[PDB]
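Q: How would the C-alpha cells look for this protein?
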Amino acid sequence: VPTVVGIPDGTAVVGRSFRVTIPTDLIASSGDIIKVSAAGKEALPSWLHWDSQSHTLEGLPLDTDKGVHYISVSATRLGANGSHIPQTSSVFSIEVYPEDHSACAADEPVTVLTVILDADLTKMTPKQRIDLLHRMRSFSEVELHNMKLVPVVNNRLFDMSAFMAGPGNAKKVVENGALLSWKLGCSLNQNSVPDIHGVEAPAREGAMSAQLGYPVVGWHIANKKP
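A: Here is the predicted structure in C-alpha cell form.
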C-alpha cells in the first residue's frame, strides 16, 4: 500500500532570497536516495540549490527566472547492480514574481540603502548569491529575506537622487555590477536616518569587501516611490 506525499506550491520574488524546507522524511524510507530537480530534468533550475543536510531548497531569482518552475522530489534505491530503481516522486511548483512584487503608507517614499558591488550575479551560483546576502547581515543588521540583490542596469554605478552616499574600496570596476539593498524606513531624511557608521566605515576601509568576497564600489541612501 504505497503512500503519496503532496508538497504545497511556493512563491518567490526576483531579487529576494527563497527558502523552503522539503519533507524528505515523509518521502524517503531509510536507505532511499533523495533527488530534487526541475521536473523532467536532472538539474534544478538555475536559480535554485538543494541543501541536502538541512533538507532545504533555497535560491535567489533573477529577472530571467520569472514564471512557474515545476520541481520534482524523488526517492530512489540502488539495485544490487547499481541501477537507480525509482520509488516515488512528488512534484510542486514555485512561481517567481517580478522584482516590484516585493510598512510605508501608500505612495510614501521608501528610504533604501544600496551597496554597489563589483560582481555579476549571472556568473554566480545560487549558493553564492545566498552566501553574499548572509555575509552582508553584519552590516545591514536585517534578516536574509529583507535584503534585495539585483544586477546593475544600463551600466549605472550611481544614483543621483541619493542624499547620503560614500565610497567603497574599489578603484576599477571590472564586472557589470550588483546592487544589494535594504529598507531603512519611510520618507526619511538625513536627520532621521539611523546610524550608518557600521556601513560607511567598513565600506571605505575594505573590511566590508573582505567579508563579502566582492569589491565594494560604494553605498548610497535614497528615497524611492514604488
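The two ends are 53 Å apart (CA to CA).

The chain has two domains: 1-102, 103-226.

Upvote if useful.
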